């Protein structure tokens, strides 16, 4: 299957800062990429799909971009509710592998 690498593995940030998280594919996934947020003791929650479309109820402070093997998730002015772990996942062909995750923690 294809693999995804996320960077950084962890990031500390302050409420109000703007951060970018990356997900790199080992092969071309042609934009079939979703992002999830997971909180402690909770199951993952869909944030963005097909690279740029936000799921229902997701605040507009979140935005995704990319193409080919490079994808990004940007978060404007983090709110306390935004800390937790973020995962990318692709839907190219017959696998649905996930990136290793990015942990975001309050500074």
């Amino acid at each position: 299957d294809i693999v995804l690498t996320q960077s950084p593995a962890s990031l500390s940030a302050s409420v109000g800062e703007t951060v970018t998280i990356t997900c790199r594919a080992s092969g071309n996934i042609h934009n079939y990429l979703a992002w999830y947020q997971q909180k402690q003791g909770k199951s993952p929650q869909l944030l963005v799909y097909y690279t740029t479309t936000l799921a229902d109820g997701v605040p507009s402070r979140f935005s995704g971009s990319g193409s080919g093997t490079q994808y990004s998730l940007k978060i404007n002015s983090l709110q306390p509710d935004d800390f937790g772990s973020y995962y990318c996942q692709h839907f190219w062909s017959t696998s649905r592998t996930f990136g290793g995750g990015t942990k975001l923690e309050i500074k």
Partner: protein
């Protein structure tokens, strides 16, 4: 209100077989795929496989030999079976609904601990 709930054996001994059931409510198993995902303690999500609305299955190539995914459309249940457990199979196992390139609804997961 789509409901996905997983139930598993809790603690199980190495070399035994594992059987997890994902019971779904509010949607039909013929119109959506169900994915199996696990998460080792403190680690990331690892995709195991999926069963399509038509019964076809796809698996993680690394674990294919140890996995079997099936479903009962009638009972609205999806099953995960894993042969010959390793202590490394210890994880929280989740079932998730797939619709148009996203996993929109997830179960809460069931923790499986491989201990002898």
């Amino acid at each position: 209100q789509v409901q996905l709930q997983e139930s598993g054996p809790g603690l199980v001994a190495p070399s035994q077989s594992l059987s997890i059931t994902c019971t779904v409510s509010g949607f039909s198993l013929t119109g959506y795929g169900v994915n199996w995902v696990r998460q080792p303690p403190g680690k990331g999500l690892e995709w195991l496989g999926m069963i399509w609305g038509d019964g076809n299955t796809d698996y993680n190539s690394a674990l294919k030999s140890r996995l079997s995914i099936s479903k009962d459309n009638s009972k609205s249940q999806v099953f995960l079976k894993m042969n010959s457990l390793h202590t490394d199979d210890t994880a929280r196992y989740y079932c998730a609904r797939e619709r148009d390139y996203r996993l929109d609804y997830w179960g809460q997961g069931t923790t499986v601990t491989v201990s002898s």
